[PDB]
C-alpha cells in the first residue's frame, strides 16, 4: 504494498488521500465537526468550510475574507438549483460526479458559479458530444 | 482525460482527492481556518481537527468526545518526540512519510500512540529488514 517510493525521498501511501476524503465524507454524513450551513433556495446543506474552500474558487474567496470566514450560514444565489449543488457537494467529498442528461445543465451552471473549472470543462465536453 | 468511468454510474476525477489534500496543506501552511494547536513538549503545531481525525484513531476518539471536541489546545504525552509528530503531521497532509534511520523509532512510537496502524506496520517491516 500500500506504499511506494516517491519521486522525492519519501515513501508515499497510495490510498492516503482518497481514504482521508472518505473519512471526511463519513464525518459529514454523521454531522461531525461541520461548521457551516449552505442554503440553496429552500434546502440546507451542512459541510466543513475547509472542504468547501479546497473544492471551490467561490468558497475559497469567501472563507479567506476576514469578515465572511466567521459566518456559520452562507446563502447562495436563489437561482442555483439545489439538486445541482447537492451533486457537486457529493463530488467534493467523493471525487464522483453523478452527471446525467436531466441534471447536466444545472450541474454546469452551479459549477460555473462555484468556480469549479475542470467540472465546467467536463460538462461542456459531454454537451458538445450530443450536438 | 483527468476523469474516468467509475465502477458505479458516476464519472470519477483521478486527482481529486490528492488535489483536495494539497489545498488543505496550503491552508495549513498559511494558517487558514486552523482550529487546534497540538502541543508536543515544547513545540506547538497548528492544524485542522477534521484532518487530524481523518488521519488518526486517537484524534478520532478525542474530537468525537462531546467534551473534548470543543478544545482549542490538545497536549500530547510529553514522551512523544516532536520531530516524530512533525513527520507524521506532514504525512497526514501530504501522503508522504519522511522515514529515515535516525527517526524511524520515534515515528513508530508516535504512530502507535496516534493509532495510525498501517504506518506502524510499515515501520516494523523496515526495521525487520535491517535485522
Ligand atoms: C494562493 C492560492 C490562490 C488560489 O487561487 C489557489 N490556491 C488555493 N489554495 C488553497 C485553496 Cl483551499 C484553494 N482552493 C481552490 C481555489 C480555486 C479552485 C479550487 C480550489 C478547485 C477548483 C477550481 O476550479 N478552482 C478555481 O476546482 C474544483 C475542485 F473541486 F475540483 C478543486 C479541488 C480538487 C482540488 N478545487 N486554492 C492557492
Ligand atoms: C464508525 C467509525 C469508526 C472508526 O473507528 C472508523 N471510522 C472513522 N470514521 C471517521 C473518521 Cl474521521 C475516522 N478516523 C480514523 C479512525 C481510525 C484510524 C484512522 C482514521 C486512520 C488510521 C488508523 O490506523 N486508524 C485506526 O491510519 C492513519 C491514516 F492516516 F493513514 C488514516 C487515513 C487514511 C485515512 N486514518 N474513522 C468509522
Ligand atoms: Cl450569505
Ligand atoms: Cl490536553
Whose grid coordinates read 439538486?
Answer: A83
CA distance A127 to B16: 22
Determination technique for this entry: X-ray
Q: Which of B116, B115, B123 is nearest to B98 (CA)?
A: B123
Interface of A with B (CB under 8 A): 2-3, 6, 8-13, 16-18, 20-21, 23-24, 27, 32-33, 48-51, 53-55, 63-64, 69, 91-92, 95-99, 118, 122
Interface contact flag, A21 B20, Cβ < 8 Å: yes
Instruction: Give the three-class secondary structure for A55.
Output: coil
Interface contact flag, A32 B2, Cβ < 8 Å: no
Q: Which of A55, A78, A53 is nearest to A63 (CA)?
A: A53
Rg (CA), chain A: 17
Resolution in A: 2.0
Q: Which of A70, A119, A115, A34 is nearest to B32 (CA)?
A: A70
Query: Which are the contacts of A2, defined by CB distance < 8 A and separation ≥ 6?
Result: A13, A14, A15, B118
Strands B3-5 vs B43-47: parallel, antiparallel or unpaired: unpaired
Q: Which of B127, B23, B92 is nearest to A23 (CA)?
A: B92
The single-letter DSSP state of residue A76 is P
Q: Determine phi and psi for A49, rounding to 5 degrees.
A: -50, -45
The single-letter DSSP state of residue B69 is G
Q: Where are the domains of chain B?
A: 1-131
The single-letter DSSP state of residue A6 is -
- Contact B90/B71 with Cβ under 8 angstroms? no
Amino acid at each position: 504494498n500500500l506504499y511506494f517510493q516517491g519521486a522525492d525521498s519519501c515513501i508515499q501511501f497510495t490510498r492516503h488521500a482518497s481514504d482521508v476524503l472518505l473519512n471526511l465524507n463519513r464525518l459529514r454524513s454523521r454531522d461531525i465537526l461541520t461548521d457551516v450551513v449552505i442554503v440553496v433556495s429552500r434546502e440546507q446543506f451542512r459541510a466543513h468550510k475547509t472542504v468547501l474552500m479546497a473544492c471551490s474558487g467561490l468558497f475559497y474567496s469567501i472563507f479567506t475574507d476576514q469578515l465572511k470566514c466567521n459566518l456559520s450560514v452562507i446563502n447562495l444565489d436563489p437561482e442555483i438549483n439545489p439538486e445541482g449543488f447537492c451533486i457537486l457537494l457529493d463530488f467534493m467529498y467523493t471525487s464522483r460526479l453523478n452527471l446525467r442528461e436531466g441534471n447536466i445543465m444545472a450541474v454546469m451552471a452551479t459549477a460555473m458559479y462555484l468556480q469549479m473549472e475542470h467540472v465546467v470543462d467536463t460538462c461542456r465536453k459531454f454537451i458538445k458530444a450530443s450536438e
